[PDB]
Amino acid sequence: KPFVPKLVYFEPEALSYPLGKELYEKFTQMGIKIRETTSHNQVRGIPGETELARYRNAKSTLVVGVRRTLKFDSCKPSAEYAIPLATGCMGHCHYCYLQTTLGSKPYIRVYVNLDDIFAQAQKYINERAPEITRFEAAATSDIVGIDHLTHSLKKAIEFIGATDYGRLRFVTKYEHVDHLLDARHNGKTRFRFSINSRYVINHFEPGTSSFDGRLAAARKVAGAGYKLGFVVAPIYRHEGWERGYFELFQELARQLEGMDLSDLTFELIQHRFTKPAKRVIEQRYPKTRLDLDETKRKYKWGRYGIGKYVYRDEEAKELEDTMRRYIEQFFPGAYVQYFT
Ligand SMILES: C[C@@]1(Cc2cn([C@H]3C[C@H](O)[C@@H](CO)O3)c(=O)[nH]c2=O)CN([C@H]2C[C@H](O)[C@@H](CO)O2)C(=O)NC1=O
Numbered sequence: 208k209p210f211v212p213k214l215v216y217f218e219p220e221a222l223s224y225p226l227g228k229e230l231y232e233k234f235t236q237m238g239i240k241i242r243e244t245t246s247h248n249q250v251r252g253i254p255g256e257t258e259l260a261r262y263r264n265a266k267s268t269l270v271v272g273v274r275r276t277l278k279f280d281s282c283k284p285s286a287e288y289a290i291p292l293a294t295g296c297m298g299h300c301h302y303c304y305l306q307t308t309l310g311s312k313p314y315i316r317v318y319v320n321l322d323d324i325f326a327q328a329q330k331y332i333n334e335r336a337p338e339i340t341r342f343e344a345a346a347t348s349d350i351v352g353i354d355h356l357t358h359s360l361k362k363a364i365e366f367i368g369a370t371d372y373g374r375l376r377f378v379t380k381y382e383h384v385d386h387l388l389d390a391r392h393n394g395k396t397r398f399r400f401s402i403n404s405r406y407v408i409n410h411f412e413p414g415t416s417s418f419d420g421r422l423a424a425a426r427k428v429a430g431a432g433y434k435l436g437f438v439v440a441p442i443y444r445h446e447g448w449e450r451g452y453f454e455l456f457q458e459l460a461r462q463l464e465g466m467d468l469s470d471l472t473f474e475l476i477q478h479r480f481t482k483p484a485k486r487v488i489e490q491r492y493p494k495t496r497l498d499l500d501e502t503k504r505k506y507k508w509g510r511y512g513i514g515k516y517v518y519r520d521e522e523a524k525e526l527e528d529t530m531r532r533y534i535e536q537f538f539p540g541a542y543v544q545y546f547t
């Protein structure tokens with residue numbers, strides 16, 4: 208608060224780039240322990256004796272590296288592509304889906320070759336133009352949370368602003384957004400914040416900024432002319448969820464009083480987990496009250512990836528309809544982009 212790692216690895220190749228040169232100067236000056244790693248894909252010697260210890264310590268470790276895979280993943284329903292600037296998070300959200308996506312790489316990775324990345328993104332925009340091409344910057348990380356250390360997203364925001372047909376979006380649980388307020392976004396960045404019921408935030412979201420912290424930060428960026436949006440995720444059927452999520456939109460609208468919310472968007476994601484995740488979360492978060500009972504769920508078989516448990520179609524529709532009614536009640540004119 209804000210995130211500063213207690214251990215930093217550098218790829219040798221990273222030091223050949225401006226941002227790699229800058230971060231090495233910054234972190235050595237701060238007196239942080241710094242190491243070499245032959246690849247950010249395989250970093251050795253993270254302290255701990257149990258897997259759980261190394262997990263906690265990885266989430267305090269930064270790895271400055273080079274993006275060698277320049278081909279972008281698709282990132283639907285959010286965006287055509289995920290622009291890869293970072294991988295990993297300092298948060299300890301019990302439900303986090305990165306526990307399966309980056310289960311083996313729980314440290315924070317930032318890539319230094321922004322010229323390569325922005326170039327390739329420009330290629331993708333050219334491939335589809337004059338159609339709009341969206342890029343998700345926070346698909347596998349809390350890019351905003353860590354950006355104060357690198358300013359990589361700020362640069363990504365300004366690059367996209369310079370393009371005609373390119374668009375950027377990202378979502379965060381962190382309030383540390385002041386350095387992004389004077390960025391030349393040119394209306395092409397959707398700045399989003401993850402929100403939830405009080406039950407879910409308090410019980411399942413340690414290491415993140417409080418609901419009020421996210422809303423203060425939300426007011427600032429809307430005040431800076433960014434496009435604003437929220438991601439209600441994970442939508443979770445805890446005891447009194449109906450009332451729990453009613454008071455969310457009630458408090459949300461209250462904290463966004465007297466503001467231009469004509470271009471406000473909402474995205475809705477029901478809670479989901481994989482079969483591995485149930486045993487991964489049980490040890491990584493022992494005393495969590497997060498229900499991972501598959502008998503309350505339906506298994507949605509995978510296509511290219513592995514399948515996952517979601518709520519039954521009927522219970523899923525109850526959630527969607529409830530969130531839609533609440534958004535329509537407190538935020539008339541706002542647009543629900545999707546429910547998943
Ligand atoms: C912030 C996200 C980013 C995102 C991630 N992902 C992938 C990458 C990540 O590793 C994986 C997690 O299962 O989900 C995706 O396919 N589409 C996305 O839009 C988060 N998600 C999640 C929800 C679900 O896990 C998956 C598919 O919708 O993406 C989403 O739908 N909307 C977003 O805006």
Ligand SMILES: C[Se@@+](CC[C@H](N)C(=O)O)C[C@H]1O[C@@H](n2cnc3c(N)ncnc32)[C@H](O)[C@@H]1O
Pocket residue numbers: 296302303304305345346347348349350378379380400401402438439440441442476477478479480
């Ligand atoms: C991995 Se999050 C990356 C962006 C940023 N660090 C952030 O937290 O907002 C992407 C979103 O998806 C949700 N989410 C995370 N895990 C799950 C999940 N298992 N099921 C259902 N949803 C899950 C989180 O609440 C986020 O709103």
Ligand code: SF4
Pocket residue numbers: 295296297298299300303304305348349380415
């Ligand atoms: S913040 Fe977004 S990413 Fe970091 S843990 Fe909570 S969910 Fe996973």
